Structure 1
Amino acid sequence: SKDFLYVGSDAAALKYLDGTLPGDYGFDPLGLLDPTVSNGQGAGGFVNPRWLQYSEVIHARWAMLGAAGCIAPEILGKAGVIPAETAVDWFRTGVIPPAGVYKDFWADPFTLFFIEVVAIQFAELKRLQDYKNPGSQSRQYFLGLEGLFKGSDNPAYPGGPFFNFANFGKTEAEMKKLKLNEIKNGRLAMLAMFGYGAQAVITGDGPFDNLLAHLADPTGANLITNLG
Structure 2
Amino acid sequence: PLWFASSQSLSYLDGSLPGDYGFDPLGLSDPEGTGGFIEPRWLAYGEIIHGRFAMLGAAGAIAPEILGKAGLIPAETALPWFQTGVIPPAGTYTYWADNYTLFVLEMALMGFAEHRRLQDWYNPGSMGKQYFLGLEKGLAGSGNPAYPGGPFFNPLGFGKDEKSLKELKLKEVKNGRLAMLAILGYFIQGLVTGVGPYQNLLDHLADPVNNNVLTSLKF
For 2:170 and 2:114, how far apart are their aligned partners in 1?
25
| TM-score of the superposed pair, with normalisation by structure 2 | 0.96
Q: Which residue of 1 aligns with 2:104?
A: 114
What is the 5 A alignment of 1:1-228? Answer: 4-6=1-3, 8-38=4-34, 44-103=35-94, 105-228=95-218
Structure 1, unpaired ranges of 5+: 39-43
Structure 2 runs not aligned, ≥5 long: none
* Root-mean-square deviation over aligned CA pairs: 1.0
* C-alpha deviation, 1:152, in angstroms: 1.9
Identity %: 64
Amino acid at match of 1:26: G
> C-alpha distance in 2, partners of 1:169/1:200?
38
Q: Which runs of 4+ in 1 moved over 2 A?
A: none
Aligned residues, how many?
218
- Partners of 1:60 and 1:33 in 2: how far apart? 18
Q: Deviation at 1:136? A: 1.5
Secondary structure of residue in 1 paired with 2:209: coil
What is the Cα deviation at residue 108 of structure 1? Answer: 1.0
Amino acid at match of 2:154: N
What is the rounded CA distance, in whole Å, between the counterparts of 2:156 and 2:14 in structure 1? 31
Give distance in 2, aligned partners of 1:153 and 1:31.
28
